[PDB]
Symmetry: D2
Subunit: 267 residues, 4 copies
């Protein structure tokens, strides 16, 4: 078991197609003992996580709530038992209001909306690190989820800016985590058909946005030398588990591309 | 004259060592007709700009003030005359509260402070573009100031995150500006001894911060194959003028490194 | 005149659609005095260059010929007059045998062929620098031509590898040239319809290769926020002249993208 | 066992401090069955590999020898048994003559020497892929060793150019290997005290070269958020094994940085 005996906190489950759901599943298959955090609809999240291979304690965490962050370490310790620390943390959280992502023109996003998205999608990575590093073991691992923002693209708009910020945050979190013997890295995944993503392809954010995602999905599988299957999150979940294991011991402040190789190819 | 007959808006002058002061000077030496914008201390800014080679109208612009942005194009047109448009825009604006930049630990920056800095240093680039593109000529140029944030560094902290966001914003501003025949690019400069920078070297942001900047300055000149003189902003001002001219007509969404070549060298 | 009084050596003219032909034309329009070098078909090259706005001495240079390189500086000094030095050098040279570029499978290129292409397309940039730096003025400029090789693409094959090598060579040439007060940079251009390029679109290197270039050309104009016109080399020639001028004085070991911004955009 | 039942070819062992020796050791500890290839001093290599945890067949391979490459697959099949294929290939080979690496000036490397180094260090990655892909299983993995060449550095000189070429080769090998269901990636390691490296620190390539490596080693550990121990190759060996396993299933044409995070940090 790749993660045997490791204690790992996984945020970001909201449905059974959430990337963090599959991260949580693969980690439990590999012997990890999990603690879960969920935002807002905790009864729904509980019913979703009941389908994980093993039962895992669920804690409430709204990343914009200072009280939630201040109590987090104590509530984690209460779930895993005093004297036990975390070996791994998974940040799988993201949000941008509709004004900053979609067919709404890039210039029309109010900063209040953009700021909320950068708060939840980028700053929260440092927030969670700060809350959880004091209860992490040496040799631990923090992993966040990324979507390659080094080039601009239709519709993603302000969320691409939030991703650019998150990659920069990750390189500073790595400097802090290094003082604990802890690594911090991001996994840049290719497009995955989550519920939200499926809703956008169906036009939830405007028809242009939906058409552009479909073109991006299609271009992705074409470019990827090993193909890309947007309906299979297993590859991304296994990559996260790789970074949570002891088998990338010299990688930190970095980005692993679980994208089928698409970013290495022009056409 | 490299910029003869061009009408160009320059923001960001606060003292005579501001990078935008030298941008403004070099552009006037090259035949440009300028309109200036200043924030807060407008009487001070006016007295500073009285020393530019030619007189230039000064307009008030706080980039966080929605009314200032809504009136900007009209006030620009009133200064340059109806029927005249802008050929160039210079964004030379930046700010991060002391909690996000310096010896204060990276985790201790409140998001309210970080958000203010990302607002003024990154989002304002899109804000100004939105305000000014409707009064820009085809073949125009928007230029912002950048400090290479692709690797983390001591003390810069949250401001590095703001720079990462600004580079991403620039690639989307380029998509909008392209509809106008307008380019958008950033100039990534090496360290320059502005008043603020000199204050930090003297310890305004804590002694550790001051020592780290000095080490970064020293490493910069060493790495740069043509040297780097932190007391000479002329090189950065000439680079901005290059991008405002017609001599980089196929460069947009991009970053020009006016850093002595330091970013191309390891040691 | 952007280049008034500057003495500049331009290699790489073979027909009137060569990128170096337009570089040479724009530089002469901007007051530069040129010395030309040509390979192999010198009578043809002479007849082509007779159409430049001004007459320019033509020197023979095969970059694989050690005797040609050993005599180059002396022959340049004889053309521009003793006591005069060069202010600028343009490397616009490239070649890969058909086995390393096209529909021939990537694995089937013999190393002898690949090595010849890397010799002429990458190593020759250091070769020319070595020959010409001792007769270059402080404040001089060396410019090479590049095609963005940071991602793989169909058909370009071994020539992409040669471009990757040339970018690396450029960063070391900059270290040598810095000792002379001389900059060294590359211009990464978008696809241009040279004779060779047109021949490939017509199938000279196999039908698959021809179809892939056409798709790459089409994707380029789409991605470029300001468009890309593959039949107009003026934009690339003006960019080279920008780097030969005094208006990028702090850029070296670097790459300027004269590609319409296409490399900054995903779709 | 991370690599249980996997059959893996490992090149590049020459002493017990070779990176490939530790790759071979860690892979055998993780249940892999190995086939080894060695160059030139095969009796020495055999005596070195006698100390691996398990015995492994040794095959002769000079990567510049066309007959060696033409027979390789057949000799591999004879060692692992007909009907068995390879699951993994490790390229751990590199060489640059003293004229292209060290205190000898960058311009003084003859192309014959540079070409030999690019042949053995870069082209050989495609050569081995071509020889071995027809005897690789779907889901297989090819891994090469890299040293981050994206910025220039003292002394490494032409070998940095060879690394730049190898990264480009890797992105095309990935396109070929994808047709087989096979991944291809590089591991960019921090400096490791091999015999050759120790000899250079002791002055084998000139005193300046030796002093610059020591400064690069020291800067590396400083920059690395988790530290860098140049005398421990275990971290790099475990990273290679990660890529040979099934736990990075969506990564290809890519580069994993096993460098302590040093490349993500400026100072
Ligand atoms: N689907 C993709 O294509 C893709 C690709 C790359 C990266 N990612 C990244 O994966 C991550 C997870 O998204 P997802 O795709 O799986 O979708 P998702 O919708 O399933 O999950 C997002 C989660 O963010 C959480 N969240 C939102 N606001 C929160 C808040 N204040 N506090 C705490 N949690 C909050 C949500 O509750 C939700 O669980 C994102 O960071 C996303 O950007 C997704
Ligand atoms: N000095 C350097 O080393 C260096 C290097 C690279 C980039 N830059 C960049 O150059 C730019 C200018 O800074 P500077 O160095 O010249 O220093 P500066 O202090 O002189 O100028 C900064 C200006 O930002 C303006 N500003 C702050 N808040 C503003 C607001 N709400 N609204 C409008 N304007 C506001 C200030 O008034 C000031 O004029 C920055 O963007 C900075 O990050 C500086
Ligand atoms: N057309 C494009 O799309 C494009 C894009 C980017 C970069 N470039 C680059 O521009 C440069 C010039 O090519 P081009 O497009 O203009 O085509 P070209 O065919 O017109 O010019 C190439 C020149 O290389 C010279 N050359 C070949 N072997 C030589 C040798 N041994 N010694 C000296 N000179 C030799 C040729 O004589 C010729 O003048 C190339 O380096 C090329 O890779 C071209
Ligand atoms: N030591 C480091 O710091 C470091 C860092 C990053 C990458 N690498 C890379 O690791 C790899 C291995 O080198 P090393 O450090 O372990 O040193 P090494 O000297 O131990 O190994 C190099 C091997 O290359 C082989 N080789 C040379 N010519 C060959 C040829 N014609 N045919 C077949 N094999 C040939 C040698 O026999 C030797 O086994 C290199 O590719 C190297 O560039 C090393
Ligand atoms: C959403 C999205 C992604 S994402 O899933 O990677 N990021 C993300 C952002 C916000 C909220 C969430 C969680 N529901 C995730 S890529 C891409 C490309 C084009 C478009 Cl229009 C959208 C997207
Ligand atoms: C300030 C700063 C720069 S900066 O001048 O480029 N950016 C900037 C940020 C904020 C406000 C301003 C305008 N006064 C400018 S680099 C660098 C490296 C280390 C440190 Cl501690 C600081 C800096
Ligand atoms: C040729 C070529 C270029 S190039 O013009 O940039 N480079 C080059 C290479 C070799 C010889 C020359 C000079 N005739 C130029 S890009 C691209 C993309 C796909 C394909 Cl199939 C080809 C090309
Ligand atoms: C050698 C070397 C490396 S290397 O080990 O990564 N590459 C390599 C090259 C050639 C032959 C081998 C195998 N003996 C390995 S980095 C670095 C930095 C500075 C200097 Cl002077 C040297 C080096």
């Amino acid at each position: 078991g790749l993660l045997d005996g490791k204690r790992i906190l996984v945020s970001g489950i909201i449905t059974d197609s959430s990337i963090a759901f599959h991260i949580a599943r693969v980690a439990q298959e590999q012997g990890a003992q999990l603690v879960l955090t969920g935002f807002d609809r905790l009864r729904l999240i509980q019913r979703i996580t009941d389908r994980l291979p093993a039962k895992a304690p669920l804690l409430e965490l709204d990343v914009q709530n200072e009280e939630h962050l201040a109590s987090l370490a104590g509530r984690v310790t209460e779930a895993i038992g005093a004297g036990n620390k975390l070996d791994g943390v998974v940040h799988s959280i993201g949000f941008m209001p509709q004004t900053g992502m979609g067919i709404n023109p890039f210039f029309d996003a109010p900063y209040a909306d953009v700021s909320k998205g950068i708060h939840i999608s980028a700053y929260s990575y440092a927030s969670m690190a700060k809350a959880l590093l004091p209860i992490m073991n040496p040799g631990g691992s923090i992993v966040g989820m990324d979507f390659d923002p080094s080039r601009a693209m239709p519709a993603y708009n302000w969320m691409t800016v939030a991703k650019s910020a998150l990659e920069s945050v990750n390189r500073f979190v790595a400097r802090e985590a290094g003082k604990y013997g802890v690594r911090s890295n991001l996994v840049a995944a290719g497009p995955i058909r989550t519920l939200a993503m499926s809703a956008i392809v169906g036009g939830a954010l405007g028809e242009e946005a939906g058409a552009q995602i479909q073109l991006l999905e299609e271009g992705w599988d074409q470019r990827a030398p090993i193909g890309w299957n947007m309906k299979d999150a297993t590859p991304v979940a296994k990559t996260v588990c790789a970074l949570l294991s002891d088998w990338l011991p010299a990688t930190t402040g970095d980005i692993i591309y679980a994208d089928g190789g698409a970013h290495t190819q022009l056409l």
